[PDB]
Amino acid sequence: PQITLWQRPIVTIKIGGQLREALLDTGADDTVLEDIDLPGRWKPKLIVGIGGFVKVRQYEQVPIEIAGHKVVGTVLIGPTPSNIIGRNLMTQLGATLNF
Amino acid sequence: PQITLWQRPIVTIKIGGQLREALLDTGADDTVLEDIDLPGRWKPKLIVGIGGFVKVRQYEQVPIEIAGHKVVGTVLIGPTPSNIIGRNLMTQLGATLNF
Ligand SMILES: [Cl-]
Ligand SMILES: [Cl-]
Ligand SMILES: [Cl-]
Ligand SMILES: [Cl-]
Ligand SMILES: [Cl-]
Ligand SMILES: [Cl-]
Ligand SMILES: [Cl-]
Ligand SMILES: [Cl-]
Ligand SMILES: [Cl-]
Ligand SMILES: [Cl-]
């Protein structure tokens, strides 16, 4: 799609059977979602959040659909003020900012 | 331009004689710059930053060039971890996210 920016760029995402929403955030390096579960192994990671650092789970090679486009990449699961799609997945999408 | 996202989307900006850089941040509502001065009146505004709230100065109808494109809009001046161009100015640019 072509997404304008007069409102927050919130899109529908889907991971397996879990339909959610998230912000397309060009100011975020990584993707962080609070309201999803995944099975299997994961690696701990620290991100910055309230109180200094927050521990999240890093899941690799996750299939995720963003605004109807399927990609595969890393998803961080843990506390976040908003679900955010970061540059790691926007690169998979081939997304660009255009003006 | 057409800006890819495999690195942080940092662009050159210019306000009067003040040439700087800033991140194009679709996760930011407003534009916040730390390393610029402007003359004249301004209105105080609180934003979220380290320690809860940070006081910045709100300047209106500021002419600013972003990646070579001139626009006019509101610029917040104060502490910020990175200079950020937010959606308020990206809308003026007619910027879109495309995939
Ligand atoms: Cl599932
Ligand atoms: Cl992030
Ligand atoms: Cl620990
Ligand atoms: Cl959508
Ligand atoms: Cl990835
Ligand atoms: Cl100047
Ligand atoms: Cl902001
Ligand atoms: Cl006060
Ligand atoms: Cl530039
Ligand atoms: Cl504005």
Numbering used by the authors:
A (entry chain A), B (entry chain A): 1 to 99
Quoted from the paper:
Protease (PR) is essential for the maturation of human immunodeficiency virus (HIV) and is a major drug target for treatment of the HIV/AIDS pandemic. Recently, we reported a multidrug resistant HIV protease bearing 17 mutations named PRS17. We demonstrated that purified mature PRS17 exhibits extreme resistance to all 8 potent PIs tested. Here, we present the first crystal structures of PRS17 in the inhibitor-free form and in complex with DRV.
The corresponding value for PRS17 is 18.7 Å and shorter distances of 17.6, 16.2 and 14.9 Å are seen for wild-type PR, F53L single mutant and FS5929R, respectively. In addition, the inhibitor-free PRS17 structure shows no conformational change in Arg8 due to L10I mutation. Different interactions occur in the inhibitor-free PRS17 structure. The Phe53 side chain has a single conformation and lacks van der Waals contacts with the side chains of M46L or G48V. It should be noted that while residues in the flaps experience ps-ns dynamics, as demonstrated by the heteronuclear NOE measurements, we found no evidence for relaxation on a longer time scale (i.e. no line broadening), especially for G51, suggesting that the RDCs measured for the flap residues can confidently be fitted to a single structure. Therefore, these results unambiguously confirm that the inhibitor-free PRS17D25N adopts an open flap conformation in solution very similar to that described in the present inhibitor-free PRS17 crystal structure.
